[model samples]
Target: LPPGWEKAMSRSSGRVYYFNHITNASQWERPSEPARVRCSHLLVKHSQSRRPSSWRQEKITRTKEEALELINGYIQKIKSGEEDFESLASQFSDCSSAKARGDLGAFSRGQMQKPFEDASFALRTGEMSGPVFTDSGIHIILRTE
Candidate 1:
């Protein structure tokens, strides 16, 4: 087996499966692509957003249009490599994860808001997504794993 990988028998089916300690992932077969993904996202909340409040603002009051504009600007900066995603996320993202450079860690299907989940999954490793609208806010997503 590769380093950090081990075989274990499933309790339910008694079938052998592979597990990876490095990524904390498991599967019935040797690993190929990950079943889960890791992402870092910068969120901009608007007045109409669900539970519209964040560490950045006590009560987010910006309009959806305004938030979209802000997110788009950030996207441009990231695309041009003029600004780093982590830096922009820490400085501007309204989400609590901004403290860790907007890290959302790893997640699987149905674990996150639908739009956000879909956008994150659609991105390739090291790719960044455009503005994605969700109930919580507008987001710029970076797929890191």
Candidate 2:
């Protein structure tokens, strides 16, 4: 953790889903022993009147309330000094950083999501953060003073 009010996130792996057909879909579960998702959902919708509906063209958005749950959960764990960044990244990370052990490298202000930015910058180095949820999921940030 770094100085300046930081947070620690505990991210559990989430499953990813994709709809293939009217009766078929795909599921990706998180790896076992890594705290992954059970049966994730990748919601889909058909296009309307003037356009052809497609997963590529369709939009996907999450509610603020839903995003908050992940962070809140991770925050609870970080506050208790029980954070496993790599494990969680492998389990729940939505980006390629999951392969890099959740290392976004060093970032300046305005480079991260609001919830993440606020929490990551709220603590001192070595300080643990609470669950900082984002559109992606819960996170435990460790800032460097």
Candidate 3:
């Protein structure tokens, strides 16, 4: 084809972030050790976009350092017999993965604003992906065995 998107008028996605918390005027404590302790819904926030972006999957792993961190952490929780995967994500997410509960399954590549796909495929099945971040937020992933 034409390099998949080598040339186009402009490829982009439309965002309708959750902004209800943006107007919150209350002071809250900073999230502790990677939690969304004070997430104001008034500002533009990241979430699965209503309209998907015009992009392709970037299944590329530059290195395995950060990837391993996420995989190992998730493995620990699963091995511990934790039933709530979401809770685990929030606890370890650099930003607020915990709140989202790390249930990012089959999210479109372009649509995953705050993605944790770096180590998605790195896991050896029945494992979790690494923590990934973007302008929107953080993510911790879990996969099927």
Candidate with top lDDT is 1
Select the stronger candidate by TM-score from 1 and 3: 1
Better of 1 and 3 by lDDT: 1
For residues 1-145, could you state the per-residue lDDT of candidate 3 as single tens digits?
1111111221254422211121111111111121111120100123332222212222222234443455455555655776356555444433322234444334333343333333343333444333343443333444443
Ranking by TM-score: 1, 2, 3
Which TM-score value belongs to model 3?
A: 0.29
Off by over 4 Å in 3: 1-78, 82-102, 113-115
After superposing candidate 2 on the true structure, give the runs of residues whose Cα lies further than 4 Å from its correct spot: 1-83
**What is the Å distance of residue 99 in model 2 from its true position?**
4.6
Candidate 1 runs further than 4 Å off: 1-33
Error of 1 at 81 (Å): 2.5
> Which lDDT values do the candidates have, in the order given?
0.78, 0.40, 0.33
lDDT by residue (56-108, candidate 2, tens digit) is 34433544455446645544544455865455444544443223444555555
Quote the lDDT for 109 in model 3: 34
> What's the TM for model 2?
0.40
| Index of the highest-TM-score prediction | 1
